[PDB]
Amino acid sequence: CSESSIL
Amino acid sequence: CSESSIL
Amino acid sequence: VQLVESGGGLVQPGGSLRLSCAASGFNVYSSSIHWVRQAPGKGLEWVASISSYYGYTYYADSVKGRFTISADTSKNTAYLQMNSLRAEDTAVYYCARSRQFWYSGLDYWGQGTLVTV
Amino acid sequence: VQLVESGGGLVQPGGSLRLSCAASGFNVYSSSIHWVRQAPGKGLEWVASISSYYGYTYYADSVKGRFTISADTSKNTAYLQMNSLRAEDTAVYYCARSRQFWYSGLDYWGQGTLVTV
Amino acid sequence: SDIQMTQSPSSLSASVGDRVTITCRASQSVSSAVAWYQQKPGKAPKLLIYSASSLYSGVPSRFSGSRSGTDFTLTISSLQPEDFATYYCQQYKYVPVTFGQGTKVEI
Amino acid sequence: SDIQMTQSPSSLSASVGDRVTITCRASQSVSSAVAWYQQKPGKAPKLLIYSASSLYSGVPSRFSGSRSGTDFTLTISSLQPEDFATYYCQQYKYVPVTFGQGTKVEI
Amino acid sequence: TRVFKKASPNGKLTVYLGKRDFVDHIDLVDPVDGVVLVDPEYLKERRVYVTLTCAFRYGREDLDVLGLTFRKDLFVANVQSFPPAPEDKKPLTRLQERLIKKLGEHAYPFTFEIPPNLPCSVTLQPGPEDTGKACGVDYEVKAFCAENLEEKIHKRNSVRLVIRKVQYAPERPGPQPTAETTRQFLMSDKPLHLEASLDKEIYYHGEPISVNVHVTNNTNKTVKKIKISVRQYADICLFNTAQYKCPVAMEEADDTVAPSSTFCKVYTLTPFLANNREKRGLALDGKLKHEDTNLASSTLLREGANREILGIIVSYKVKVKLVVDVAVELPFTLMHPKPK
Amino acid sequence: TRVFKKASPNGKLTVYLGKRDFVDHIDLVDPVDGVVLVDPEYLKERRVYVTLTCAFRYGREDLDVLGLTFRKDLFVANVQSFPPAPEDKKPLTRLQERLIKKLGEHAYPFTFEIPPNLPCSVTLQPGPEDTGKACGVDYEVKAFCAENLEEKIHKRNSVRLVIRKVQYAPERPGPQPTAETTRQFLMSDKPLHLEASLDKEIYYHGEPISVNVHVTNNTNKTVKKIKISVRQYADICLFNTAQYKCPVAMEEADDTVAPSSTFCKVYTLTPFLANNREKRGLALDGKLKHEDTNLASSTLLREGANREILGIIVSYKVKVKLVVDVAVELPFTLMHPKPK
């Protein structure tokens, strides 16, 4: 599944 | 074309 | 079941007159009303007709544009509006009923009001 | 621009009371109105919300079914119906506004009528 | 266009009880779409036959129809005192509806 | 489901001009959906930060947010005499919106 | 009597029919039959065939995009005529044998027993921008001379006839339809009771529809308007059923009924095609040529099963609505009488 | 900056993105770009492709011809990532290069220059009976290890992202729309003059629409009711154009005007999706998933040509109608503001 990450 | 006749 | 028609009279050439054929016992949507004049002592001539179910109206060539025909569907009465009456059009204007589904002759007739230009 | 709120009072357990949040300067269709109480000396707690654009209404578990929230769109005022009040429900009942497109926090707040047991 | 409708004879007479025939020719082919009408002196015409053969309701059986090509015939098996009038042949296959000139039946 | 916003410290004090930081952990990943409120004694709260970093209109620049995973922080660059109040941490990624327990700042 | 015919452009093949419209009695369909007049020396193709085709040429607006239109032959049957086939040997009807006498030994018969449950000849009203052949269910009779079925049909030698399958009103009327609905409201715990009732089950075309209405408003709410409209349903089911809907006549009345009061009157509506011309997709009764015909009459489904019907199925019911909203629908039958 | 990402089910391939809603500036579309993190030691195939797909999937009334749901890729572009393509010597964006720093040499870039005039991400509201993939125009980003294009891609090593192409309200307003119609009647050449205007050209979603109306009636006929409604059109044009026709909000006032009199008031329409759920085929703004989204915002065609735009094009106008009938239609724009 999709996720997120902080540059 | 269409038509008609009397027996 | 019958057609009652009224409004005949005298109008000199250039005038206009209104005839009404008030039916009774059948709706104008299930029928088509035709106006069948008949010059004094001559044969019949169909002048105009209306078929409310489809909305079409038909006029004879001798009266194309001169006359206008309409019917009030709320009370099943039909009107002929004759404009610019002339010498040759004096006659008795019987109205008549033609079954909408489908045409089977003018089975019911008015009483024949009189128009004498 | 602001939210005018009124309708506080005292009701013993088993009673019911009605609060209203009269909006001004924006429509309830471009906004969603949330009722955000605060027990005396305790922290905030969100108790109900309405989003007229979609028609959804959300209630906290502690007031699931007990309360009912609605708002007429003609005058853009939202009502909250409390039924079977209890002691733990005593609190201030700040009304609040959350942008519908899209949520960005409760930027405008009412004034917080009281409720007591 | 107009379907010229010649009808003959323009006048006739027959004794009471005699059989008479009225002939009507459609200048074009109108299929079986013809109707026959009786018009007592001065009053509204009355419908007798439609489809060129179908006898209308209420009318005496003495009236009858028939077809042969573009020639149409209306025949009365027995002419009675009340049968003297003017009869008109009408087609209704194409607008404008065209009526015949008529044939007065005389004493 | 419920998302306990364990906010700390539950109380603190700092002199005017001193920098103050308030931390707020989300018991579950709430993305960047957090907002910070200022509630003066007894009056309606006021929104300062949304999206956990964005500064609202009107509020002074002295308020700045920040994020690190499930840990959120609100930092006042220099506390002022009118900044003594109760600040509440709110998440809004999941209904029900849940508020922190608050941190009263004292003179 | 008179019989129809059509002579092929080739002139050597002509097909005769007793009638063009064949009635359907729910359980049976009148057998399509006639004769074909053929001669050997003009018959270079060595055999003569007849072919009854039942087609369903759809193409409604949903497929207007993509441009493509489709037709599926819902029923096809063939018979061999010039070389008499024993498999087709059936006793001749009175009309067929009379025509055989009239024509001589140089004509050959045919006959198709159309099975029931096939859709009736129905056309859907084309839109003002349409220019193709009218969509709907139709029947067509084909007679041709060819060496075998594999040989392509010759536009210079073939006869194309269009017949239609028609239904007529039952001689015995149904029960006087009635319908009512009761509603409850939070503002007041008393009901809003609505009734409606037509006069008779079956209505002929053009005949005015008449509705009895009665409203008992015991609530605190006020009935803003009384809306009555008659709506035509046309079930389309080739592979899986789809539904479309059209109101053919409507009468909005500003009449209202006060709280805790009763209202009662009789309305009248008459469906007609004059004002419904603009209504794209409306079902019209099967046309032979590009003529004008009435609104599609109701379809009499076979028994109560009403299962696995193809093509278009048309049905009517009239909805009575109150703008407090509350609505109730009444079914009725719409088709011509049996011609005498 | 909170970049997105997605990991292939096997975990061998993952694709990063800076944002998922790419604004459209009428004349240019923001370039889709990111990076793919791959490891050669598990990539003996030696190709890592990325595929942008502008799918158009459409439903409507095709079910009656069976489940003939069709889709046509309005635009497809591909790029080769793991083996650096020699011809793709295009400078990286700030986001791509900073991600490369974050990730090291085991990540490779890509970028698609979506051309203008491609339809905006729009969804058509499914009916209650529809359960398949929601129809409409959508965008999707694929990334898969492979050895050639002809070989079917394995679900094991494929990543599917759904982005959407979004359009925002212009920074400046248009002109105050106005419209009027003058009617003459058979009774006499005496006009019935109707005007209408709106407060402003652009209305954000949920904002009320103020309609300014004025009626001057010099005829003997009486305006029985005033009908004002706001209606949404969605121009569907894949091969040949088709027009949708769907109201979204309506107000019916029983206001009237006596002969030789004037009437003037301001109404307030406000479109919203709460009461428009039942309207199948209504246009909704493109979703990133099976979430809830507002009514489809209007579409801004490129330049004044507005020629040959595929997919679905949405536009709004409000109709003012008088039941004497006389009507006038007035356009307006309905889209969100540009977020800060």
Domain range summary for chain D, segments of one domain joined by +: 2-115
Length of chain C (residues): 117
Describe chain B by its helix, strand, coil percentages, rounded to 5.
0, 70, 30
Distance of CA E53 to the CA centre of its chain: 11
CATH class of H4-166: mainly beta
The three-state DSSP-derived secondary structure of chain D is CCEEEECCEECCCCCEEEEEEEECCCCCCCEEEEEEEECCCCCEEEEEEEECCCCEEEECHHHCCCEEEEEECCCCEEEEEEECCCHHHCEECCEEEEECCCCCCEEEECCCCEEEC
Set of chain H residues whose Cβ sits within 8 Å of the Cβ of G239 = 64-66
Single out the residue of D103, D94, D81, D78 nearest to residue D24, CA to CA: D78
Across the interface, whether the CB atoms of C109 and E96 are under 8 A apart is answered no
Distance from CA of E20 to the nearest CA of C (A): 21
How would you label H70-103 residue by residue, b for 16+ Cβ within 10 Å and e otherwise?
Answer: eeeebbeeebbbbeeeeeeeeeeeebbebbbeee
User: CA F67, CA G189: separation in Å to the nearest integer?
Assistant: 55
User: Can you list the alpha helix ranges (DSSP code H) found in chain H?
Assistant: 94-103
Across the interface, whether the CB atoms of B3 and G98 are under 8 A apart is answered no
Please tell me if residue C65 touches chain E, with a CB cutoff of 8 Å: no
Please tell me if residue H241 touches chain G, with a CB cutoff of 8 Å: yes
For tokens 């299929």, the residue is E31
E58: phi then psi, degrees, rounded to nearest 5 = 85, -25
Helix (H, G, I), strand (E, B) or coil at G103: helix
Residue G328 · residue G194 · CB < 8 Å: yes
Work out the angle at residue G183's Cα, subtended by the Cα atoms of residues G181 and G189, and round it to the nearest 5 degrees: 145
For H165, the enclosing helix (H) or strand (E) is strand H164-167
Single out the residue of E58, E25, E43, E94 nearest to residue C44, CA to CA: E43
Residue H232 · residue H284 · CB < 8 Å: no
Chain B: touching chains (3 or more CB pairs < 8 Å): G
Q: What is the DSSP string of G235-281?
A: EE-SSS-B--EEEEEEEEE-----TTEEEEEEEEE---SSTTTT-TT
Residue H211 · residue H228 · CB < 8 Å: yes
Across the interface, whether the CB atoms of D29 and H275 are under 8 A apart is answered no
CA dihedral G96, G100, G103, G108 (to 10 degrees): 90
Set of chain F residues whose Cβ sits within 8 Å of the Cβ of D34 = 97
CA dihedral D92, D95, D99, D104 (to 10 degrees): -10
Strand partners, E25: E6, E71
Please tell me if residue H294 touches chain D, with a CB cutoff of 8 Å: yes
Please tell me if residue H250 touches chain A, with a CB cutoff of 8 Å: no
Distance from CA of F22 to the nearest CA of D (A): 16
Structure tokens at C96: 């008549």
CATH class of G178-335: mainly beta
Please tell me if residue G19 touches chain B, with a CB cutoff of 8 Å: no
Residue H332 · residue H209 · CB < 8 Å: yes
Helix (H, G, I), strand (E, B) or coil at C72: strand
Domain locations along chain G: 4-166, 178-335
Length of chain D (residues): 117
Helix (H, G, I), strand (E, B) or coil at G97: helix
Length of chain B (residues): 7
Across the interface, whether the CB atoms of G242 and H66 are under 8 A apart is answered no
Set of chain D residues whose Cβ sits within 8 Å of the Cβ of F52 = none
For G94, the enclosing helix (H) or strand (E) is helix G94-103
G337: phi then psi, degrees, rounded to nearest 5 = -75, 165
Phi-psi label, residue G143: left if phi above 0, alpha if psi -120 to 50, beta otherwise: beta
Across the interface, whether the CB atoms of C94 and E45 are under 8 A apart is answered yes
Across the interface, whether the CB atoms of B4 and G5 are under 8 A apart is answered yes
Residue G85 · residue G79 · CB < 8 Å: yes
Across the interface, whether the CB atoms of C109 and E44 are under 8 A apart is answered yes
Q: Which of B1, B2, B4 sits opposite G2 (nearest CB)?
A: B4
Distance from CA of C19 to the nearest CA of G (A): 24
User: CA G127, CA H197: separation in Å to the nearest integer?
Assistant: 32
Q: Which of B1, B2, B7 sits opposite G99 (nearest CB)?
A: B7
Is H245 annotated to bind a ligand? Reply is yes
Helix (H, G, I), strand (E, B) or coil at H247: strand
Does chain C reach chain E with at least 3 CB pairs under 8 Å?
A: yes
Q: What is the DSSP letter of G27?
A: S
For G329, the enclosing helix (H) or strand (E) is strand G326-334
Q: Which of D31, D55, D101 sits opposite H294 (nearest CB)?
A: D101
How many C-beta atoms lie closer than 10 Å to residue D82's C-beta? 23
Structure tokens at D28: 């309830």
Is H321 annotated to bind a ligand? Reply is yes
Mutation target to probe the G interface, by most G beta carbons within 10 A, among C30, C73, C103, C107 is: C30
Set of chain H residues whose Cβ sits within 8 Å of the Cβ of G62 = 60-62
Residue H223 · residue H272 · CB < 8 Å: no
Structure tokens at H320: 């003012």
Residue ranges making up the domain that contains F31: 5-107
User: CA G35, CA G159: separation in Å to the nearest integer?
Assistant: 13
- Kindly tell me the burial class for residue H115, based on how many C-beta atoms sit within 10 Å of its own C-beta (0-12, 13-18, 19 or more): exposed
User: CA G318, CA C39: separation in Å to the nearest integer?
Assistant: 48
Helix (H, G, I), strand (E, B) or coil at H155: helix
- Check whether the bond before G116 is cis (ω within 30° of 0): no
F19: phi then psi, degrees, rounded to nearest 5 = -80, 135
Is G245 annotated to bind a ligand? Reply is yes
Residue G52 · residue G32 · CB < 8 Å: yes
User: CA H300, CA H288: separation in Å to the nearest integer?
Assistant: 21
Q: Which of D49, D107, D110 sits opposite F47 (nearest CB)?
A: D107
Set of chain G residues whose Cβ sits within 8 Å of the Cβ of H241 = 65
Single out the residue of E32, E46, E42, E39 nearest to residue E91, CA to CA: E32
User: CA G185, CA G220: separation in Å to the nearest integer?
Assistant: 9
Pairing type for strands H164-167 and H21-24 reads: parallel
Chain C: touching chains (3 or more CB pairs < 8 Å): E, G
**CATH classification of the domain holding E82:** 2.60.40.10
Residue G223 · residue G260 · CB < 8 Å: no
Across the interface, whether the CB atoms of H5 and A3 are under 8 A apart is answered yes
User: How many domains are there within chain E?
Assistant: 1
To the question of domain D2-115 being in CATH 3.40.50.2300, the answer is no
Strand partners, H197: H178, H212
Q: How far is CA C64 from CA C60, C67, C115, D4, H62, in A?
A: 6, 7, 18, 73, 49
User: CA G302, CA G117: separation in Å to the nearest integer?
Assistant: 6
Distance from CA of C108 to the nearest CA of E (A): 8
User: CA H63, CA G109: separation in Å to the nearest integer?
Assistant: 42
Is G187 annotated to bind a ligand? Reply is no
How many C-beta atoms lie closer than 10 Å to residue H130's C-beta? 15
Q: Which of F39, F56, F97 sits opposite D46 (nearest CB)?
A: F97
Across the interface, whether the CB atoms of D46 and F96 are under 8 A apart is answered yes
Across the interface, whether the CB atoms of A4 and H5 are under 8 A apart is answered yes
Distance from CA of B3 to the nearest CA of G (A): 6
CA dihedral H148, H154, H159, H161 (to 10 degrees): 90
User: In terms of CA atoms, which chain G residue is nearest residue B4?
Assistant: G4
User: CA G125, CA G278: separation in Å to the nearest integer?
Assistant: 9
Across the interface, whether the CB atoms of C107 and E51 are under 8 A apart is answered no
Q: What is the DSSP letter of H171?
A: S
Count Cβ–Cβ pairs < 8 Å, chain D vs chain F.
53
